[model samples]
Target: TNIEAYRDGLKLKTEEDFFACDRQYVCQNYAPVPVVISKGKGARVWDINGNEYYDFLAGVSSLSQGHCHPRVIAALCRQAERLTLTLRAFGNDVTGPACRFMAEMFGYDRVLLMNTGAEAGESALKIARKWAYEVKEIPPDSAKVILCNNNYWGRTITACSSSTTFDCYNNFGPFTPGFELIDYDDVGALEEALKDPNVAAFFVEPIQGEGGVNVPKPGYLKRAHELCRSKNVLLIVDEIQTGLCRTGRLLAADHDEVHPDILLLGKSLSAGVVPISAVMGRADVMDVLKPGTHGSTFGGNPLACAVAVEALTVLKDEKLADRAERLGAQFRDCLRRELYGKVPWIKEIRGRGLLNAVEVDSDAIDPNDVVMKLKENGILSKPTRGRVMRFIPPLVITDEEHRDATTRIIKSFLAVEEERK
Candidate 1:
C-alpha cells in the first residue's frame, strides 16, 4: 500500500509532462531532446515508457565503453566503497597510479588532473601562457593562444572565449583577451598565426567533435606541429571528444603521428562513470605551474582516479581502437550505400571512428525533424549544427547491433523523405 501510494503520488505520464517539470525546476540553458531515458545496456537505451532504441549519440561520445559497462561500473563501485574524495591538499593512493599510467600511455612526462574537459582546456591555456611567460620569456598579459574556427572545447569562460560559435561566445563578453581564431584545416593560417613570437600556443581538436564531426585535411596536424615548433609555440590538442579509442586511435593525434606539447583528454577518460579529465604535456611545459599555482578540489580523488585508470585500461584490453576502426568504416559505408543516392536531402557522411556525422541539406528538410523521426523509429541521435546530425555510437557497439541500428537509421531517413513528399 505504501509503495503503491508513493508511486501514485509521483505520477508522471508523458515526456511532455516530464519536460514541463524540467522547465519548472531545471535551468533554461540547455535545449535537450524530449526523450527521458530510464535504462541502457551495451548499445541500446530505453525511454521511461519502455520504448527501446539504439543509442547512436552515446552521451555525445562520452559513453565510449557503452552504458553501464561492467568493467567500468565494477571499478567505480570498488573504489567508491573505499574512498571518494581525499582532496588535492593531501595525496591519495589511487591518483598516483592513474597519473603514471596515463603519462606512460600517452607518452607525456606529466599530467595535471581536472574534473571536466573545460577545466582541462582552461588548464592547458593557463599552462601555455605561464610557460610562455616563464620559459619563453614572453611579457605578461601579451601571450596569445590561437584556436581554430568552429572549435568547441568547453563552456568555461576562457574556453568560451576561445569558441567561435555565436551561441557559446555571444553575450559572454567582454571575453578573455589574447585568443585568436584561425580556419580549421588551413595550414597556411596556422603558419601565419605562428609567425607571431608572442603566440604561446595553438589549441585545436584533431577531429572537431561538436563542430559537425569536422575531420581535417591530410597532414594538417603534422604541418601545424612543424610550424609551431619553428615558432616555439606549444601545440595543445583537445582530444576531449576524440580521445581514448573514440576515433579508432588511442589519441586522434595518432592519425597524424604527431605528439602535441599539451594534450587535453576527457569524456571517455572515466568511461562516463565520474567526471575526470587530464591536461597532459611535456615536463618543461607542465612544470610551469609550480606549487600554489593551480589545483582542483575533486580533480584527483581516489575514486575518480580508479575509474579513469580502469577506463583507460579497458580501451587497450578490449582492443577498442581496432574495433572502432573496423566499425566506423562499416557504419559510414552502410550510410552512404543505403541512403546517400536515395535521399536527396542527405548531403554527406564524414568522421573518424565512432565520431561520425550526416550533413543534411537544410533547404530540403529540417535536421531536427529527422532526429525526431529517428527517435520514433527506435534510434537515438542529435544534430550538431543546423544541418549536421552526429551519430557517435559507443566503441563497444557490436557488429550485429551496428547492422540493425544502421538499417533502422536508413528506414528513418526513408520515412522522412516520404513524409516530405
Candidate 2:
C-alpha cells in the first residue's frame, strides 16, 4: 500500500490523496475547493503545484497590506529576535508602545488590547452593561443593547445574544437576555428602541459587514448617530471587520462623521500577520472597568505589540487610509461596469471604501458556485451566505492590479452565465 502511494508519483498523489484525506478527516464545515495554497506575496497566492491566483478574498479582509508584506514580516522577524511574550499579568517591552501607537492611530485615549474580535466585543458588552447599571442607573437585569439583523460580531455569548440571524443563533444557548434586535438602516425602529430610558447602549456596525455587505441608505448612519446622541445612549460600533482601511477609512464611523462612545477594531489592526485587537472609545465609558474587571492573557503580547507598531506605521506612512479612498472608487466603477448587470444572477453591487459586495440572486443561483468558478479562473473569493460575495482586498493594491483582478472576476461571472446556457 505504501508502494502504491509512491507509484502515482509525488504531484498527482499529493494533491489528490492529501485533499482526499482532508475531506475525510477534516470536519465538513466548509466546502473548500482543492486549491491547496502554498504561499503568497502582495496580491497573489500560489497553489502547491505553483498555480498562482489573484487573491481577491484577501484573507477574509484581514490581509490589507497583502500576504507576508515585507515591512510587516521584517518588523515581526526583528522583534522576534528581541522579545516575544510576557503574560498580560505582567507588562512587556512592546505593549505600552503598541498601545500608544494604536490609541493615537484610531483616535482613542485609552486602549485595551484584545486577541480577537470576539474578545473586543465581550469587552464592549461588559462596558455597556456595567455603564448601564453603574452610571445610567438602569437595573442590572433590565439593561438592553440592540444589534442589526444578520449582523456578524463573532461567536461570543453576548454577541450571539444580540444576533437576529438563524445560523449565528443555532444550538448556542441558554442565551444571554436583554438584547433588542432592530432592522439594519431602520431609523424609526432605532428611535423607538431608544425610547426605553433603561436601554443602556445600541450596538451598530457603520456598514453591516456580514449582512451581505449592506450599506445603510444615505443619512441612516448619521441619523442613528444623532438619535444615540440625543438619547444620551452609548453608540457602540463593532468595526471589527470594517475598520482599519478595509473600508478606506481608519474607522468606518468616520464616514458618517459619527463618534461612537465605544469603537472596536481588529483583523487588519495587525495587518493579517499578527493577531492583535483593541477596543477604544471615550475615557469615561471605557474606564468603568476596574483593574480585575476585564483582561486578556495574550492580549498585548510582545510579538503582537511589535507587529502592531510596524503595522500602524505602515498604515500611516503608506497613507493606506487615503489610498483605500481613491482606489475604492476605481474598483467600484470597474465592478459595476464590467461585472454587474452582465451577470443575471448578480443582484447588486454595494459597500463602501474597499469593503464591497456583489450580491447574487440566491433564487437564480447559489453564490458559492460562483466563488468556485472564480477559483477555477485563478481568483479566490468566498460567499458570505449563499448569495453575497464580498470583495475586500488590501488597501495597498495598485491600480493596474485592481483592474486586472476585476477583469478576472467578470470572466468568472461570465463563465457561470455560459454554463447556465
Candidate 3:
C-alpha cells in the first residue's frame, strides 16, 4: 500500500503519468518499473520505497558533478534570483561569456546555444549542410552527414533519423535522409564513407555513450579527423554525453589528439541544474548560420548561461577533467583485476574515463536482466543496444564511491551468473 501511495505521489510529481500510472495506460514500449526517487545526495539516490542506490546511471552521465552538487546549486540559486529566461530574443551578458569560455576550453571559435542535446545536434546538422551548400559549394539538399552504426544521439526527429539503434529509431520515422551510416570502430568504413563528395560533415560520438559506452580504438577519432581534413569534410563531434570532462578529458576527442571542426555540448553544460546545449565550431563553419537561419527561443538565456559559466569554471578550476582521467584509470584497473575474468558472464569490459562497459553476451544472458540485477543490488545502470551494460557514473564520483560501485557491480554480476547457470 505504501508502494502504491508512493507511486501515486510520483505520478503527480512527474506528471507524465507514464511510469507510475502503470495500469490502464499501455504504451508500445516495455513497461519501466518506476523507481520513485524521493531525493539524491552526491552519488546516492533514494527511491520512494527507501531503497538507496549508488546511482551509476547519473542521469545518463549528464550529472557530471553528481546530483545537486553544491556549486551547481549555488549557481542556480544565485541566477534564479536575478533572472531565468531571456528567450534568445535579446542578448545577455552571461551567454556570451559562457559561450566564449567553452569555446576557449574546447578550441572552437564560435558557438550556437540550444536547450537540449538533440537541438544542439540539429544545430550542428544544419550548419554542416548549410556550409556544404553555401561555403563548400556542394549541391543543395544533396549534402549528407556521416554517422556511426550502433550509436545514439537524441530523440528529436532528425536525431532519430541519424540513429542506427532500434529503440531510438522504432516508430520515429519516416525519417530524414542524407545521413550515411558506417560500421563504428572501423577506420576503413569511415574512410570509405567520406568518398562521397556530397558528404558535408562526419558527426559521431567519440565514445558512443548511449550505445553502451563503446570506447573506440585509441586513434579512431584522431584518424577520423585526419581523414575529414584530407577529404574536405568537416569533423563534427557530438559530445552531448561525453564532453565536459565525462570521459576524463575536457572532451572525448582529446583522448585521440583530434580537434573537431564542430563540438556539440549538452547535459552538464548547465551542470544538470538547467538544460543547456550548444554547438561550437570554427568561425568559418559556424558562419554558415545566417542571422535568420536558425535559433532557439530558450537558447542562450541569461539564467542558463550564468550556471554554465560557473559549471565550466568548476570543471576547469576544480580540475574535474583530470579527475575523470585518473578515476577512469582506476575504474579500468578495478574492472580488469577484480570484476573481469572472475565473472564468466561478463563477456567483455570496455570504456574510457568514467564511462565503461560490462558486456554479457546477450545470447547467453539478457543484458537488461543484468541491469535489473544491478538495480536490485543498488547500483543503477542500463543496457546499451542489446547486451552491453554501460557504467558511466558522474565525473565527480570519488575514489571510495567508485570502489563501492565496483563491488556492487561485481556482486550483481555474480548473482546473475549463478542464476544463468
Candidate 4:
C-alpha cells in the first residue's frame, strides 16, 4: 500500500457508508458501479475493500497510458511545485511552449487549449462559426453547423441543441439554433446538407465513441472531407474519445488521411489526471478568437500543459498505438469466437482498436446483467444506451494482462450465457 497518493484514512470505511453519503450529498446524475475504487495502477484498479479489477472502461478511453502513469504523474507533480495557473491575460512560458509542442505533434499551426472535450468542441464550433461569417460572408446568425445523429459534445446549451440524444436535450431548452442534424456514416445525407452555401462546418467523430462506438464505412471520413472541401465547408472532427492512440492511431482521423479544418481533442490528453482538451487548426481558421471573444480561466495552466506533454511523450515512447492495435484485434477476434454465436442476445462485436463495443439485443436481455457479470469476473465496463457494451481498456495494458483480462471477460460473457440457458 506504498502507492504515492494513497490516503491513509477516510471518514467512512465500508462501500455502503460511502454509497449512503453519495446518495445524500452527491447529485443523482450518474448511477455508477457500486464498487468504490481506492487506487489504481496500469490497467487495474482496486476497490476500497482491496478487490482488484481490470479497468476495462478506462475512464471512457481517457487513461491511454493507464492509471497513475509514472511519467505523467511526475510531470504533474514537478510542475505543481513551480507554478500551476497563469491566466491567459499574462503570457506564460509553459503555456506557449506546450501549445507549440501540441501544434507540431498534431500537425496543426495553432492549438487552443481548453478544460474539457465539450469546451474544445464549443471552441471548434465558435471558430467555424466566426470563420463562416467573417470570411465566408454568411449573413449574420444564418450560418448552419451540421452534426450527425447521436453526436455527444457535452451538456452546454449549444451541445444540447446539436445533440440527438433525448435526455441530453430534454427540458434544457430553449436550445441554441443554427445546427442541422444528419445521419452518421451517410455520405449522401452529408452531401445534401452541404449544398447550403451558409453551412459553416460539418462536425463529426471519425468513429463515434459514446454513440455506440459506431464505426463508419472505411472511407466515410475521407469522403466527407472531400464533400466539405468542395462546398467550402469546414470539417470539424471531434476525436476526444478516438484520439490519443485509442484507435491504433494518434488521431482516428489519421486513418482516413483527412485533415480537419478544426480538430477537437480531449479525454486522454492529460493521461486521465486532469482536464485538458484542445482545438487545433491552421492560423486563418483558429485566429478567429479575438480579444474578449472566448476565454477559459483555468485553461492552458502549466500543470496541465506539463502533464499533456508527458502524456503525449508516453504515447509515442511506449508505442501505445501498436499495443492498442494488436490487443484490440485479438480482443475482437476472441469475443467473436467465444460469444458471437453462443450469446443469443449479442448483436455485434465491433471496434477499430481499444475503443471496442459489443452491442446486445436489449429486447432479449438487460445490459446491466452483463455489466454485473463482467464486474463479478474481475473486469469493469459500462454500456452506452443500456445495450452498446463498451470494452475500452487502457492502451498500456501488458500482453499478459490483456490475455488474463480477456479470459476473464470472455468467461463473464459465457457465464451470462449460462444463466440465460
Candidate 5:
C-alpha cells in the first residue's frame, strides 16, 4: 500500500515488485540501483517514496544544465508544436541554421548531425576514411583509424570492436577492422602508430570520460596534435561526454589550444532533453561525403535542433563552464583533504572540472559498501571499473547545494570506513 507505483492500472506495491516487473519486462544491460527515481530537477531526484537524493552521475554528465531546464524545455515544446520530424531529404527551417550556429561556435566548416554519440563517432570516422581516399590519397580500403585502449564511444559493433574492456567486446566478434589500437596517455605509442601510411586519423578523448574519468598528463593533446599533424593524420577529438561545459570549457581540447581536424559532440547536446550528436570538420575534409553517402532519419530534426540551440545558449548565458571549473577545484580539494589519507582503502582522487572520481583499493574494501553508504547518505552515483566512484553532478548545482552534497559524499566514504573498523 505504501509503494505508490502504478503505470496506468498496474500496481507496484513495493520496490521489490518494481524490480520483479523490470526483470520480466526490461532488458538487463545495467545493474541499476534499488532506488527507483521518479522525478529530477536541478541536480536532485526523488525516489518512489519521495525521498530526495543528489544526483551525482547527472546522466553521465549529460545534464549539466540540470534536468528539465526551462529554456530547453520551452524550445522543445515550441518546436514540437510547429514540426517535430520530417524526411532526411527535406531540409527543415531549424536544421540548416542550427548547423550554421554549431559550425560558427566550434570553428568548423561543416556540421553533420546524428542522434547518438556513437553515431557521431561513426560519422567522424566515415568522414576521415573518405578524406583519406579522396584528399589524402590513401589506398582504397586501407585507411586505418587509431584509437586508445579503454576508449568508449558507444555500444555499436564498431565501437565495441575498439574497446579494451572484456565485457564490451568478449562475445561481440567478427569485429570491425582497420582500427589500430594504442595505449592511452602514451604519446610515444600514438607517434609510433602514425608512422603507418595507412593511418587516416587518430580519434581520442581529451580526458577519457567513460574510461574512469582518466585525465591524461599535461600537454598530452598538444603533443598528440603535433604528431598527427606531422604524419598528416587527421586528429578527431571525441568530445561527446566531455563537451558542453561539463569539463569547465566548451570542449576539453580547448585546454590544450589544439584545434582538432574533426570534432564529435553529443550527450548534453540537447541538454539531455533529446538525442542529438554532431560531427564537424573543415570543408575540404567534410566534402568527401556526397548527399547519398550517409544520413539519419531523426538526425537534425526540428525538435532536436531547437533544443540543442537553446541548450548551447544556456551554457553560455549561465557560464556553466566557469562554474564547473570553480566547483570542481573545491570538490577535489575537499575530498583530498578530508579523505585521501584518512580513508585507508582509497587509492586516488582524480578528474578535472566536475568529472571527478574516487578510486578505491577494492581488494581492501568492497566498493559496493561505499555505493550503498552513499545512497543511505542521500547521495546517488555509480562507479566505473567497479572502483572509480564518479561524481559528475550537474554544472547548474548551486554553491550551497554543492557544498552540502560534498559533505554527504565525504560522510558516505567515512561511514564505509567506520564499518570496516
Candidate 6:
C-alpha cells in the first residue's frame, strides 16, 4: 500500500500525500498556505514540486535577514559542534558575553533572554508588576497595565487577555485580570487611563504589525513617553515584529527618539535560524527579579546566544535598515504609479521600511484569493484580517528581486481584476 502511493522523485511520494500525513498528525491550529517548502535561500523558497516562489512575507517578518543566511548558518554550525544548552542551574561560557553584546547593541543597561515573543511579553509583565509594587509603590495585585485597543503582543493567556481581536479573544477566558484598554494613538485615552493611581505601566507596539501595520501619528510616541514619565507609569514597547532593522531603525522606538522603560524583541534576533527573544530595559526595572523568581530552561542557551550574536552582526554589517528604507520607498512608488489607479480594488498602500501592506477593497475583491494568485505567479504574501495583504520581503532582497516581485505583483492583481470583471 505504501509502495502503491509512492510515485515521487524525492523522499516524499507526492506533495499531496505528504500534506495528507501532515494534516493527519499535526495540530490544525494554523491554516498554513498549501505549500510544502523544501528549501530556501536568500529571498526565495522552493516547494516540494520544485516551484520557486519569492518570499514576500519573510516568515511573517521573522526572516528579515533572509532564509539560511550564510553567516547565521556558519555560526549555528560552529556552536552546534560545541556546547548547546547549559541550564541556568550552572553558568554557561557564552551567555554572559551574548548579554553584554546585545545590551551594547540595543543601548540597554540590562537584558533578559526568553525563547519566544510570548515568553518575553510574560516576562515583561512580571517585571512591570514587580517594579510597580516595589519601586512605584502601587498596591500588590491591583496594579493595572494599560494596553491599546487593536494591539497584539502574543498568544499567552496574559497576552490574549489584553487583545482586542476576535480570534485572539474568543473562548480564551476566564482571561487574566488587572489589565485595562485604551485607544491606540489617542493621547487623551492614554492620559486618562494613566490618571488612575493603580495603573502600573503602558504596553504598546511602536508600529502595530499584526494590526495591519497600523503606524501611529507623528510625535505620538514621544508625547506618550512624556505622559508616562510625568505620571510615573512605565512605558513598555513590544518591538517583536518591528525591531532590529525591519522598520528602517535599530529599534522602532528610535523612529520617535523615545526609549521605552521596557523593550521586547524577537523574530529576526536569531536571523531566522533559531528562536531567541529578549527583554531589554533600565537596570532598576530589570533588577527586581532575583534568582528563582523567573527564568527559562532554554532562554540563554549557548547555541541561541551564538546564533543571535551572528544575526546582530549581519544586521549591522549589511546595513539592513538603510537597505530596507531605500527599497521600501521604491516599492511603494512602483505600486502607486503602476497599479494604484489601474487596479480599482486597491484602497491604499502604506507601511515603513520593508514592513509594507496593500489595503484592498475586501468587499469588492477577495484579498485571500489575490494572495493565492500571487503564489501562482511565483510570488508569496499573506492577507491579514481578510483585508490587507502584507508585503514584508526580507531585508536582504536585491534591487532586481524587488523589481521582479513588483512585476509579479502587478500581474497578480491584473489577473484578479480580470476574474472579477
Is candidate 5 or 6 superior in lDDT? 5
Tens digit per residue, CA lDDT, model 1, 306-407: 888888888899999999999989989888988977899988889888888899999999888899999888888878887899888888888888888888
lDDT of 4 by residue, 1-421 (tens): 7543343354576899889978998999998987999899999999989999999889898898999999898899999999999899988789999999999998999999999998998888889999999999999999999999998888888999999899999999998889999999999999999989999999999988889999999799999999999999999999899998999998899898888888888889999999999999999988888889999999898889999999999999999999999999999999999898888898999999899999999888878988999999999988898899999999999999999999998998888888888
lDDT of 6 by residue, 1-421 (tens): 6664553433565778778878898988877788888889999999877999999888778898899999999999999999999898989799999999999998899999999999999999999999989998877689999999988888998888999999998998999899999899899899999899988899999988888888889988999999999999999999899999988898888999988889999999998888999999988889999889998989999999999999999999999999998998888888888888789989988888898989999889988889899999998887788898889999999889988998999888889988998
- Quote the lDDT for 379 in model 1: 86
What total of clashing residue pairs does each candidate reach?
0, 0, 0, 0, 0, 0
> Which sections of candidate 4 miss by over 4 Å?
1-11
TM, every model: 0.97, 0.93, 0.91, 0.97, 0.98, 0.96
Question: In model 6, which residue pairs have backbone atoms overlapping below 3 Å?
Answer: none
Candidate 3 residue pairs in clash (backbone atoms < 3 Å): none
Error of 3 at 45 (Å): 1.0
Candidate 5, 165-190: lDDT as tens digits: 89999999999999999999999999
Rank the candidate models, highest TM-score first: 5, 4, 1, 6, 2, 3
Candidate 6 similarity to native, TM-score = 0.96
Poorest 10 consecutive residues by lDDT, candidate 1: 3-12
- Mark the regions of model 6 whose C-alpha exceeds 4 Å error after superposition: 1-11
- TM-score: the better of candidates 2 and 3: 2
Q: Which residue pairs show backbone clashes in model 4?
A: none
Cα-lDDT of candidate 6 = 0.90
Error of 4 at 167 (Å): 0.6
TM-score of candidate 5 relative to the true fold: 0.98
User: Which of the two candidates, 1 or 2, achieves a greater TM-score against the reference?
Assistant: 1
> How high is the lDDT of residue 335 in model 1?
89
**In terms of TM-score, how similar is model 4 to the real structure?**
0.97
> What RMSD, rounded to one decimal, does every model reach?
2.0, 3.5, 3.6, 2.1, 2.1, 2.7
